[PDB]
């Protein structure tokens, strides 16, 4: 419920999950990462869309079953004097696999000769500094984009909505929800047993 207190959004569309039904399901393994986008490539943070940006820096996997949250930022980190806080990787040797945080300082080469620290030649720096000013409308504008990942690994659910639980009922064919496992049937006492670790 704290999501809606963060201005009108250019986001909240989701793939593989229902944004309207965010309280009934229960799961675990929640990971969240934060970055910024220019604004003209907001839709580039999506499975199946591959270009230059979000391909050499952070490639979203096809099997991600998650979505992002974002809104316009004209008073948070946009200054008239400029904001040089954020950078991104211009050049990479090959395509970057998903969920790999990489650091690079060495000079990217564009020829057959060796190149590690030589400037003024066809080798170029693989990074550049952002320039954020209000004179750019959509092309150069900071955004409050945060990616959220949902993992459906076989584990007991830990984090979900604060909805209260009801009393146990027996010998009735009803619908049950046990840590996000929706099922229908009649509940009976279990004569079966196993080692108490599952």
């Amino acid at each position, epitope marked *: 419920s704290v999501l809606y207190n963060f201005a009108p959004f250019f986001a909240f569309k989701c793939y593989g999950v229902s944004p309207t039904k965010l309280n009934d399901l229960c799961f675990t393994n929640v990971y969240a990462d934060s970055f910024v986008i220019r604004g003209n490539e907001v839709s580039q943070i999506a499975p199946g869309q591959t270009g230059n940006i979000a391909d050499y820096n952070y490639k979203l996997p096809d099997d991600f079953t998650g979505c992002v949250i974002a809104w316009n930022s004209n008073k948070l980190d946009s200054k008239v004097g400029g*904001n040089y806080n954020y950078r991104y990787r211009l050049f990479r040797k090959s395509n970057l696999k998903p969920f790999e945080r990489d650091i690079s300082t060495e*000079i990217y080469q564009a020829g057959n000769k060796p190149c590690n*620290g030589v400037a003024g030649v066809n080798c170029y720096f693989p990074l550049q500094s952002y320039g954020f000013r209000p004179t750019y409308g959509v092309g150069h504008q900071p955004y409050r984009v945060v990616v959220l990942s949902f993992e459906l690994l076989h584990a007991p659910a830990t984090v979900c909505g604060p909805k209260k639980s009801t009393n146990l009922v027996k010998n009735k064919c009803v619908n049950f929800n046990f840590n996000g496992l929706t099922g229908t049937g009649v509940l009976t006492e279990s004569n079966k047993k196993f080692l108490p670790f599952q």
Partner: antibody
Amino acid sequence: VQLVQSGAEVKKPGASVKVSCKASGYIFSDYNIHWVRQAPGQGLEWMGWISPDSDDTNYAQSFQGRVTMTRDTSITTVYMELSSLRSDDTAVYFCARSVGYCSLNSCQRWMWFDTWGQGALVTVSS
Amino acid sequence: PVLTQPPSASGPPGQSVSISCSGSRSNIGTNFVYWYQQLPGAAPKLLIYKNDQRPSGVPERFFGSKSGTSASLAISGLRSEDEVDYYCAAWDDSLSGHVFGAGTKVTVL
């Protein structure tokens, strides 16, 4: 516009001197500021960078504990102090300032002193 | 530390005077070097930034380019702007900050 610095005159060694850098015109919350000293007969020498909206402090690898600066966002000025002055560390001080705002070490590749502010050359003598 | 720069560089007008700036691999080649000049009793002014572009009000005879481990500056004609000392601005990781030159005293002949 240009920046100012309230320097001092010739002073005895082993004392404390306080200067004040006051902004003028623009709202002093978006420009990263620097400091520099230029010895007579020598070149400029870098000291550090601070931002007058957050608690980020950095120094060079020669004056880590020698200097200590204070920031006042509401008062809208920046002080720094020199303690236990020797005969060689005294130099002319300019309140440097670079365009843009960032607080990372890798950001300094694209950070340069686009504009310069005037200062003063306080000195030391016994 | 400070970079090795020749302080005694001069020449008659009509020819080219070259001033070089020696530095380490982390200072020159992996970082963008800058060129600045200053007057006695006056604030320094920007002449060459990023070694590719020149700002407004700067004469086009100024030139600063990088080609290896040591940058250099070349000037053509010494009439009014090359009678004052210059500086070599660069950034490295030797002190977690920027470096400056020792001053190149250039006179008029």
